[PDB]
Design a protein around this motif. Sequence first.
Motif, mmCIF file in Angstrom:
data_model
loop_
_atom_site.group_PDB
_atom_site.id
_atom_site.type_symbol
_atom_site.label_atom_id
_atom_site.label_comp_id
_atom_site.label_asym_id
_atom_site.label_seq_id
_atom_site.Cartn_x
_atom_site.Cartn_y
_atom_site.Cartn_z
ATOM 1 N N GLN A 6 0.520 -0.973 0.297
ATOM 2 C CA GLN A 6 0.046 0.322 -0.592
ATOM 3 C C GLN A 6 0.904 1.395 0.111
ATOM 4 O O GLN A 6 0.608 2.151 -0.717
ATOM 5 C CB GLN A 6 -1.527 -0.268 1.779
ATOM 6 N N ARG A 7 1.383 0.990 0.821
ATOM 7 C CA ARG A 7 2.650 2.422 1.371
ATOM 8 C C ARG A 7 2.317 3.813 1.138
ATOM 9 O O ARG A 7 0.712 4.498 1.076
ATOM 10 C CB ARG A 7 3.721 2.396 0.468
ATOM 11 N N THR A 8 2.847 4.782 2.335
ATOM 12 C CA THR A 8 2.088 5.823 2.827
ATOM 13 C C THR A 8 0.924 6.218 3.186
ATOM 14 O O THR A 8 0.145 5.308 3.412
ATOM 15 C CB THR A 8 3.129 7.277 1.999
ATOM 16 N N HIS A 9 0.948 7.231 2.824
ATOM 17 C CA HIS A 9 -0.366 8.526 3.744
ATOM 18 C C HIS A 9 -1.105 8.028 4.723
ATOM 19 O O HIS A 9 -2.107 8.039 4.865
ATOM 20 C CB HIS A 9 -1.968 7.802 2.266
ATOM 21 N N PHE A 10 0.093 8.256 5.916
ATOM 22 C CA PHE A 10 -0.276 8.561 6.959
ATOM 23 C C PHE A 10 -0.824 10.642 7.717
ATOM 24 O O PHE A 10 -0.004 10.599 6.546
ATOM 25 C CB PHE A 10 1.008 8.024 8.061
ATOM 26 N N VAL A 49 5.062 -1.388 12.166
ATOM 27 C CA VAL A 49 6.080 -1.570 11.108
ATOM 28 C C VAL A 49 5.961 0.408 11.005
ATOM 29 O O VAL A 49 6.822 0.601 10.668
ATOM 30 C CB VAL A 49 5.045 -1.218 10.077
ATOM 31 N N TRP A 50 5.614 0.814 12.271
ATOM 32 C CA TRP A 50 6.125 2.603 11.625
ATOM 33 C C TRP A 50 7.432 2.701 12.647
ATOM 34 O O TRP A 50 7.878 3.429 12.028
ATOM 35 C CB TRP A 50 4.172 3.596 12.334
ATOM 36 N N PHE A 51 7.187 2.524 13.671
ATOM 37 C CA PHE A 51 8.146 2.163 15.411
ATOM 38 C C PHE A 51 9.666 1.485 14.667
ATOM 39 O O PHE A 51 10.664 2.330 14.636
ATOM 40 C CB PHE A 51 7.494 1.354 15.973
ATOM 41 N N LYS A 52 9.559 0.321 13.692
ATOM 42 C CA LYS A 52 10.467 -0.366 13.208
ATOM 43 C C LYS A 52 11.178 0.533 12.273
ATOM 44 O O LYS A 52 12.070 0.902 12.079
ATOM 45 C CB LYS A 52 11.129 -1.733 12.776
#
Length: 68
Positions: A6-10, A49-52
């Motif tokens: 998917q990737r990104t769009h936070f 996955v954000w934290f690593k």
Amino acid sequence: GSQRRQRTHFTSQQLQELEATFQRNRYPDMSTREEIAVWTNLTEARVRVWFKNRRAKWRKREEFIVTD
DNA sequence: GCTCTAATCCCCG
DNA sequence: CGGGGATTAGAGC
């Protein structure tokens, strides 16, 4: 897998809880990673996955350098 | 072709 | 349980 990636769009609201947590705890347990997911309407693996990636892209930009 | 960084693979204890 | 580097992936220059 089946759906590629998917990737990104936070959204910036997610980053404003994630960074404010990363300045007090760099290594949260699943019992805390699910709370961070309640405050953002994410799920625990999305926080993980954000934290690593945060520790990996600390290293892949600075390797050792911190100001904290 | 290259950066930048998330989504994941294989490995480590 | 889940960190850590390698890796596959995705949008912009």
